[PDB]
Design a binder for this molecule. Structure first.
Ligand SMILES: [Cl-]
Length: 168
């Protein structure tokens, strides 16, 4: 077997590594994307997935927008099959220091919880959105109470920070 999780906690598995490669070998079904909610797809995740889908993501997005409402931090929306057997879920995390940063985040995990098949997803609202990893995790673990989930990060420091979460 090839890409192995570097930590495992309940049915959540944590992977480090590049995106395309993860998608490629982990073969998911739902790729959760971290999107800033009026839906320009910039930075490590989104600018990533968009490119991988040949930019279909963005094409569906402008489309989406004409007959549907911008996504409200604390909400996510699903684009079914942006590729064949590849669904992208557009998660809008809260910014740092809006209110119930807490609650909002958890709904996002909660909504993610809800999907079908293999999920690959990054940690919401971490990175540019400047929310502590501790929390996005804290929330993650709480919410997706029971289902297999595939979380990925990019950095080392990230990877580590996660390990010490479980060690203490
Ligand atoms: Cl909703």
């Amino acid at each position: 077997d090839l890409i192995l999780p570097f930590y495992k906690a309940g049915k959540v598995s944590f992977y480090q590594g590049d995106l395309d490669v993860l998608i490629n070998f982990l073969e998911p079904d739902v790729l959760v994307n971290a999107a800033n909610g009026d839906l320009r797809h910039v930075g490590g995740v989104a600018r990533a997935i968009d490119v991988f889908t040949g930019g279909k993501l963005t094409k569906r997005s402008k489309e989406y927008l004409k007959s549907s409402k911008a996504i409200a931090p604390g909400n996510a929306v699903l684009f079914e099959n942006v590729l064949e057997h590849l669904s992208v879920l557009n998660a809008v995390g809260p910014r740092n220091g809006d209110s119930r940063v807490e609650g909002k985040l958890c709904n996002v995990y909660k909504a993610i919880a809800k999907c079908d098949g293999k999920i690959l997803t990054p940690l919401i609202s971490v990175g540019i959105f400047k929310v502590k990893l501790e929390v996005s995790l804290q929330c993650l673990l709480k919410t997706v109470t029971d289902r297999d989930l595939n979380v990925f990060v990019y950095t080392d420091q990230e990877r580590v920070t996660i390990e010490n979460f479980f060690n203490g």
